[PDB]
């Protein structure tokens, strides 16, 4: 019996309500407050230059056609009431394939205050494009954006605003980080304007700033390559009588660098420019290939100009370790400072 | 005022017959298409397809939707598109396409006082284009996109690009990781099927592959190993330790290069240009290694002739390899 009063109120609002017209059509501009709660920041894929994010996307506007009076000032209604009224057609400009979860029911809420103000939130999983500049891989950083706005209403009809100060209108859950290798340092919230072939639209933007963590690549790639190079220079200290032994060092060391280079090539995303890792492998490849050449030269002069052959080995015991030490100083100081 | 617009809109949709195209049983209705490309990505050689995202707009006039008294371009909710007549435009070479539906179905409907209707959609179509990988990676691919009406012939519907060559916008902002869009072209023509003749609009891109990193990553390691294998010819056989090390390292390294690339490239019947060079380099480094094993077995027997073999091999390998390289490049460039 108590619900009968609320049944009349709901049936009174929807009577004569045409949901095909935005509020204040041809009279003013519909203002839509917006804020986002990031429940979890999903993994970032370098192979596809995309990322995933789950949001409690909230919207709020004013519709004078839904004013009422009753026992309760707020009508916490069901998500099926949303389809009966007008709602913004907000989409994501750089979204690739987003999902609006509807398990076990459509994840939407609708609340109508007594003065017509509406609150209409939903749970989304947006996968967005994020262009990446991988010149300084794996010591690189990015700023993945997230742009959303109206699809059919120009900026003279619908304008989007943040509910609070732009810094505090996007909140990230403390435990939501699902990033394996990246590290979310912070986010920036901004607003902008776009001008398509149909008109001018208001675009709300938010950039998430990510810096990759170098820990994995030091263990997998950098340290084994350095050990292999240091292993290569061991051949210089062996006495000249163990000629067959030095042959093993030259052949196996070169072959080892092939395995590391190929295995580390899989982690390299498909690009058309030389990354920072490629320079390190290319230089380390030269040192190993230089040792084999050096051993070839000494073995060539041996038993023909033995005095000259021993002179090469004395210098090689110093030149090779010194240059590889200098190269590390130049390589790391150049990239780590950026 | 607000009720007036509702009255006007309901007046139009009362008696509107969705099953009948505008000017049914009369002149064909002209439809103009604008495409605003958003991104092109994943140009897969294995699947012979590319992924294209765009804004797809269509313009046409429906005399039944003309209204008067409201000097504004009505922009109705996208759910009204289920009650109007819209062209049945499809893409012939499309494999798997969808219209984005977050937060709502990405769709636009605009009416005009004279009846002109703008109907926009945001589509991510995975079109198909076969590629001739004979000259890979020194090849160009001409990937297209077909647009055609399904159920209406040229007696009912007519297509035309809106704005001439300016109908398609946003091609320059595309930055493919491995390709480079040299040019795009727009074509309008008719297609004759067994059930009639249908209009068709064709948008085609000509992609030229970037060879900037293929040369460095592939050809230089092949050439350096091939040249490195020649050094064994100038080394006297008394210093046979170097020759064994050079011979074993080169072939094994060359073998790894040839095997690794095949497992990381698309698989096809024809012999790609990249396979010819790897096969050529592998044969040359294999003969050099086999050359040493021939001399080593025989130099104890006839050291006069055995040592003379390396003297000529210092000419045969550099001469033949240069000649092979000259034929290859002038045949594949």
């Amino acid at each position: 019996d108590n619900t009968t009063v609320f049944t009349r109120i709901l049936d009174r609002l929807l009577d004569g309500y045409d949901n095909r017209l935005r509020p204040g059509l041809g009279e003013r501009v519909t203002e839509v407050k917006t804020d986002i709660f990031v429940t979890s920041f999903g993994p970032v894929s370098d192979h596809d230059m995309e990322y995933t994010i789950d949001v409690f996307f909230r919207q709020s506007w004013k519709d004078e056609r839904l004013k009422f009076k009753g026992p309760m000032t707020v009508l916490r209604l069901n998500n099926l009431m949303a389809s009966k009224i007008w709602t913004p057609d907000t989409f994501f400009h750089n979204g690739k394939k987003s999902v609006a979860h509807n398990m076990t029911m459509p994840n939407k809420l609708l609340r109508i205050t007594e003065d017509g103000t509406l609150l209409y939130t939903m749970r989304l999983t947006v996968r967005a494009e994020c262009p990446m500049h991988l010149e300084d891989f794996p010591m690189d950083a990015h700023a993945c954006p997230l742009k959303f706005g109206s699809y059919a209403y120009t900026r003279a009809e619908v304008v989007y605003e943040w509910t609070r100060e732009p810094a505090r209108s996007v909140v990230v859950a403390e435990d939501g980080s699902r990033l394996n290798q990246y590290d979310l340092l912070g986010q920036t919230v901004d607003s902008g304007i776009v001008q398509s072939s149909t008109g001018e639209y208001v675009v709300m933007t938010t950039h998430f700033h990510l810096k990759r963590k170098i820990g994995y690549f030091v263990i997998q790639t950098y340290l084994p390559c350095i050990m292999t190079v240091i292993l290569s220079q061991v051949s210089f200290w062996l006495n000249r009588e163990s000629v067959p032994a030095r042959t093993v060092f030259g052949v196996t060391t070169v072959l080892t660098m092939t395995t590391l280079s190929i295995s580390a090539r899989n982690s390299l995303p498909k690009v058309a420019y030389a990354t920072a890792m490629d320079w390190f492998i290319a230089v380390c490849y030269a040192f190993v290939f230089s040792a084999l050449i050096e051993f070839a030269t000494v073995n060539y002069f041996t038993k023909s100009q033995p005095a000259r052959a021993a002179k090469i080995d004395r210098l090689s015991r110093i030149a090779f370790p010194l240059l590889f030490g200098i190269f590390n100083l130049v390589y790391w100081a150049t990239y780590l400072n950026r | 005022n607000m009720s007036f617009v509702k009255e006007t809109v309901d007046k139009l949709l009362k008696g509107y017959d969705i099953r009948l195209r505008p000017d049914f049983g009369g002149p064909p209705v002209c439809v103009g298409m604008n495409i605003d490309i958003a991104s092109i990505d994943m140009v897969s050689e294995v699947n012979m397809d590319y992924t294209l995202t765009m804004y797809f707009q269509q313009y046409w006039r429906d005399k039944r939707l003309a209204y008067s008294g409201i000097p504004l371009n009505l922009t109705l909710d996208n759910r009204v598109a289920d009650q109007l007549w819209v062209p049945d435009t499809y893409f012939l070479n499309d494999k798997k396409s969808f219209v984005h539906g977050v937060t709502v179905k990405n769709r636009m409907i605009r009416l005009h006082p004279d009846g002109t209707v703008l109907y926009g959609l945001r589509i991510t179509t995975t079109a198909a284009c076969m590629m001739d990988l004979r000259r890979y990676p020194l090849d160009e691919q001409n990937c297209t996109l077909e647009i055609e009406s399904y159920g209406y012939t040229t007696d009912d519907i007519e297509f035309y690009w809106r704005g001439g060559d300016k109908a398609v916008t946003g091609v320059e902002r595309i930055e493919l990781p491995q390709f480079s869009i040299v040019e795009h072209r727009l074509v309008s023509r008719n297609v004759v099927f067994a059930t009639g003749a249908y209009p068709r609009l064709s948008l085609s891109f000509r992609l030229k592959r970037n060879i900037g990193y293929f040369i460095l990553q592939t050809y230089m390691p092949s050439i350096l190993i091939t040249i490195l294998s020649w050094v064994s010819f100038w080394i006297n056989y008394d210093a046979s330790a170097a020759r064994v090390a050079l011979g074993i390292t080169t072939v094994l390294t060359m073998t790894t290069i040839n095997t690794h690339l095949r497992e990381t490239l698309p698989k096809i019947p024809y012999v790609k240009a990249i396979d010819m060079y790897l096969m050529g380099c592998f044969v040359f480094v294999f003969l050099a290694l086999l050359e040493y094993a021939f001399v080593n077995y025989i130099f104890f027997s006839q050291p006069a002739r055995a040592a003379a073999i390396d003297r000529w091999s210092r000419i045969v390998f550099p001469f033949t390899f240069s000649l092979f390289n000259l034929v290859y490049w002038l045949y594949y460039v």
Partner: nanobody, 123 residues
Framework: QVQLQESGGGLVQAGGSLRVSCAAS????????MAWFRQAPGKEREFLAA???????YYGDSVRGRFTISRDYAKNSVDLQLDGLRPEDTAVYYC?????????????????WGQGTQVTVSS
């Protein structure tokens, strides 16, 4: 070597259009963000406008509704239309390009920079 050369500008009197243009060379800035910075004499360097790959236009709070930025991706260049110029607009205008790490309104986020172009408004 990547260079950002500018042109346009000059002397204008109490408003009126004055277009300032910037052209890049040596690198394709299709995927970067090309912005515009104004540096009044001795005060500081101020953000004016920016445009990323998606043609999204950002503006400062003091030039909103007056200036207009418009890239030309084919020619790898960016322009900036000035309208209703004021005496306070007399400054040197700079051309920047970068990825906008830690925001796009911060000069520290733009690695590449232009030489500059003096713009003076008469009174």
């Amino acid at each position: 070597q990547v260079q950002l050369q500018e042109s346009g500008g000059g002397l204008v009197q109490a408003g009126g259009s004055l277009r300032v243009s910037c052209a890049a060379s040596g690198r394709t800035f299709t995927t970067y963000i090309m912005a515009w910075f104004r540096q009044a004499p001795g005060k500081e360097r101020e953000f004016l406008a920016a445009m990323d790959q998606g043609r999204i236009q950002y503006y400062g709070d003091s030039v909103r509704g007056r200036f207009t930025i418009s890239r030309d991706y084919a020619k790898n260049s960016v322009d900036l239309q000035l309208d209703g110029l004021r005496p306070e607009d007399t400054a040197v205008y700079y051309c920047a390009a970068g990825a906008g790490f830690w925001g796009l309104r911060t000069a520290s986020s733009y690695h590449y920079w232009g030489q500059g172009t003096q713009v003076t408004v008469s009174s």
